[PDB]
Amino acid sequence: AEEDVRILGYDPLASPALLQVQIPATPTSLETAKRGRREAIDIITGKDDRVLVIVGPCSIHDLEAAQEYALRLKKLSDELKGDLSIIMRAYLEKPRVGWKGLINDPDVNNTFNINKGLQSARQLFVNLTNIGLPIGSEMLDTISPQYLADLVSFGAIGARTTESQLHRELASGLSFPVGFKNGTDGTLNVAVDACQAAAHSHHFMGVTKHGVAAITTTKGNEHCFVILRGGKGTNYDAKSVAEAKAQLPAGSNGLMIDYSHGNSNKDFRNQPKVNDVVCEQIANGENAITGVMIESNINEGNQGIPAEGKALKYGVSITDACIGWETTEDVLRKLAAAVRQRREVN
Amino acid sequence: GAEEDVRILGYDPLASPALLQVQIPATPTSLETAKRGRREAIDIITGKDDRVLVIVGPCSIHDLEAAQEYALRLKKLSDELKGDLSIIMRAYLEKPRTVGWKGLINDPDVNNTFNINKGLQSARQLFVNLTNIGLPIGSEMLDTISPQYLADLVSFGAIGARTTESQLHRELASGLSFPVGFKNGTDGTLNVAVDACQAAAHSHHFMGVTKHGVAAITTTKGNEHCFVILRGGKKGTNYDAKSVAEAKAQLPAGSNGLMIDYSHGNSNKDFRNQPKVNDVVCEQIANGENAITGVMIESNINEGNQGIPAEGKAGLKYGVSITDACIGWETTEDVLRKLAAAVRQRREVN
Ligand SMILES: N[C@@H](Cc1ccc(O)cc1)C(=O)O
Ligand SMILES: N[C@@H](Cc1ccc(O)cc1)C(=O)O
Numbered sequence: 001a002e003e004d005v006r007i008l009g010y011d012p013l014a015s016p017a018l019l020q021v022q023i024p025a026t027p028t029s030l031e032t033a034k035r036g037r038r039e040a041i042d043i044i045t046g047k048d049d050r051v052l053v054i055v056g057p058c059s060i061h062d063l064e065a066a067q068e069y070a071l072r073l074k075k076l077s078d079e080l081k082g083d084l085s086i087i088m089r090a091y092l093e094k095p096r097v098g099w100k101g102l103i104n105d106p107d108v109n110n111t112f113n114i115n116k117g118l119q120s121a122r123q124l125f126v127n128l129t130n131i132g133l134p135i136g137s138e139m140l141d142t143i144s145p146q147y148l149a150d151l152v153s154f155g156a157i158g159a160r161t162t163e164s165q166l167h168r169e170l171a172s173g174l175s176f177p178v179g180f181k182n183g184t185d186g187t188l189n190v191a192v193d194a195c196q197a198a199a200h201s202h203h204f205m206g207v208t209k210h211g212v213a214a215i216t217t218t219k220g221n222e223h224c225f226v227i228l229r230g231g232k233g234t235n236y237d238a239k240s241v242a243e244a245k246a247q248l249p250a251g252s253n254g255l256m257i258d259y260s261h262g263n264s265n266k267d268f269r270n271q272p273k274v275n276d277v278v279c280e281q282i283a284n285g286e287n288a289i290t291g292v293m294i295e296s297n298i299n300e301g302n303q304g305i306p307a308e309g310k311a312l313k314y315g316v317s318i319t320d321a322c323i324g325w326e327t328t329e330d331v332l333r334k335l336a337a338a339v340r341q342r343r344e345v346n
Numbered sequence: 347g348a349e350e351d352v353r354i355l356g357y358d359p360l361a362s363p364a365l366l367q368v369q370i371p372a373t374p375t376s377l378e379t380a381k382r383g384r385r386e387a388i389d390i391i392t393g394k395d396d397r398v399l400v401i402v403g404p405c406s407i408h409d410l411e412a413a414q415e416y417a418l419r420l421k422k423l424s425d426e427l428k429g430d431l432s433i434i435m436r437a438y439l440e441k442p443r444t445v446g447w448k449g450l451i452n453d454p455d456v457n458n459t460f461n462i463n464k465g466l467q468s469a470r471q472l473f474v475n476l477t478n479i480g481l482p483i484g485s486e487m488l489d490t491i492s493p494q495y496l497a498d499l500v501s502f503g504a505i506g507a508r509t510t511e512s513q514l515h516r517e518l519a520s521g522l523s524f525p526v527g528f529k530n531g532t533d534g535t536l537n538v539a540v541d542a543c544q545a546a547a548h549s550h551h552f553m554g555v556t557k558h559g560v561a562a563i564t565t566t567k568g569n570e571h572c573f574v575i576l577r578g579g580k581k582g583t584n585y586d587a588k589s590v591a592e593a594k595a596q597l598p599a600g601s602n603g604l605m606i607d608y609s610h611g612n613s614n615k616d617f618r619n620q621p622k623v624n625d626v627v628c629e630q631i632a633n634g635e636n637a638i639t640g641v642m643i644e645s646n647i648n649e650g651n652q653g654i655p656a657e658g659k660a661g662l663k664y665g666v667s668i669t670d671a672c673i674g675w676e677t678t679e680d681v682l683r684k685l686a687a688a689v690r691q692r693r694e695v696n
């Protein structure tokens with residue numbers, strides 16, 4: 001009998017329940033999460049005319065820098081809350097080459113420690129939600145969300161998994177809105193199909209809170225939407241948006257636009273130009289644009305990890321390039337103005 | 347309180363991999379055959395062997411008895427063509443949906459109900475039944491849990507077009523005990539499949555399950571037996587001399603040989619195109635194309651496909667797919683004899 005010839009070992013994993021006791025959610029974390037969800041729901045279904053904003057770092061390698069970022073984001077959020085509902089990006093990895101993410105390599109020293117990773121991720125998420133800021137993250141697989149789901153207001157399925165049956169089944173049992181990205185080829189038919197699929201009940205192999213594989217029956221998720229993110233070209237302009245709307249069946253949730261990634265084509269400086277174009281549409285009465293996504297840090301750009309380890313410029317991304325804090329301020333103020341102007345066209 | 351499991355109707359218990367592997371024991375012939383298909387696929391894709399690897403059989407197995415019959419014929423044809431073709435039966439369990447049968451694992455009674463436990467039983471009993479006659483099998487690797495129930499029996503695993511980009515499926519592949527084919531993207535380009543073969547070569551840590559059914563961090567070695575499967579897509583069919591040359595142009599140093607799926611995007615919404623694909627491919631091969639080391643074919647006892655009727659399972663035509671349309675046995679046997687001949691020609695040219 002020949003099995004496990006390419007398995008080096010099975011390493012012990014703390015169960016979700018074990019981590020949920022060890023790093024407990026505060027009342028404020030839990031309330032913050034549920035509020036982010038309600039607000040998101042009202043925006044994507046058209047009941048609120050504010051725009052949903054998912055903004056923050058490409059990924060979080062540094063919990064302390066992330067806390068200092070979050071505080072600025074939260075104060076900005078208090079001021080702009082008439083117009084914008086703000087959820088911080090609390091993403092753990094970048095689509096894989098270079099740094100393997102906070103779950104895999106939380107000490108940013110190219111080793112593995114998935115257990116300490118899940119602890120860091122959970123501690124992060126609690127730290128952020130506890131100051132009253134809702135968070136969003138990528139839904140990576142069927143296991144890790146069980147460690148974190150109590151804290152999350154928004155879940156994303158990346159371009160690379162929108163087609164994946166398992167991620168569509170998973171999205172169908174999650175306790176929050178899920179955005180599906182358009183395919184890496186730059187078409188959205190895959191994200192429309194994901195939304196439809198995810199709206200139905202499925203059965204997938206999940207894990208229970210005690211860390212055992214079990215058959216998991218889902219209810220279906222009515223709060224999935226499509227996220228425009230470019231690809232093979234950019235797709236944030238009015239013609240692209242018109243074609244996107246032409247593909248959504250009646251009763252669709254609103255569209256979200258990502259300013260980064262394929263939309264900014266290899267230059268983070270392009271994010272504010274994406275905002276200008278998206279604001280012009282929203283100002284002019286485009287009610288189908290209900291969300292945006294922005295890769296923002298304290299300081300702009302990105303950096304490689306140098307011979308010296310985790311010790312690295314503070315508040316600078318080690319995955320995708322971000323716009324810096326002051327650009328983010330300008331960018332978000334200008335969006336809120338668009339929002340108010342759309343109100344008056346309406 | 348916490349707001350979790352709003353959209354979870356429940357959690358049902360699963361027999362563990364090890365429980366199932368005791369309850370449906372593999373025979374010494376099942377285990378030898380699985381090791382043998384592996385060795386042979388390995389030799390072909392890495393160029394130690396000039397036969398062609400053929401993954402051939404139904405789109406999906408909904409009927410164990412009809413597959414068993416299919417298999418008896420395929421094994422007799424294979425005994426006869428073994429100088430030229432290494433044959434592995436498609437023993438696939440699902441098809442990519444948005445209506446339709448949910449597969450053998452989800453819905454083993456083919457009646458729009460769900461019994462996952464009975465389903466993994468049917469799958470594993472099916473793989474034992476097939477491999478027990480000395481026929482090796484391949485299947486799609488769907489997630490990180492199901493393979494743990496069946497991996498002892500598998501010679502070939504496939505990652506479909508819709509998951510080739512998925513990090514989790516690349517990671518899985520890096521720890522599987524057998525060769526893995528990654529299909530090119532639904533857009534008809536293969537960069538995503540080359541990237542996946544590269545990634546799967548490496549060591550990864552993924553969240554899998556032990557043999558006793560508990561989630562564990564599963565550390566892998568890397569899988570040096572991954573290859574690319576050409577299956578068409580939105581750019582067009584890719585089984586022609588030109589497409590293969592553009593394929594070859596993108597393979598990195600160290601890459602294993604190419605497989606050509608005659609079906610799916612390459613049949614272009616018509617199963618009767620698979621013999622035509624074969625001729626075009628058989629022609630390249632016979633004139634000296636050594637970069638084509640594999641083919642994939644959707645084949646059943648009888649041709650075509652069918653919906654599931656109101657009457658249910660009892661209303662089904664025997665030996666006819668309920669998922670993608672397949673060529674019939676007669677036409678498969680022809681396709682495979684011309685294929686075997688192309689391989690013979692190729693030997694002469696070299
Ligand atoms: N047992 C599988 C490897 C595997 C698959 C899935 C899993 O969760 C763990 C381990 C093999 O020999 O190929
Ligand atoms: N607990 C998740 C649902 C879930 C995710 C993953 C899983 O394996 C089981 C169940 C939620 O509230 O969204």
Ligand SMILES: [Mn+2]
Nearest residue numbers: 058094295320
């Ligand atoms: Mn990013």
Ligand SMILES: [Mn+2]
Nearest residue numbers: 405441644670
């Ligand atoms: Mn098929």
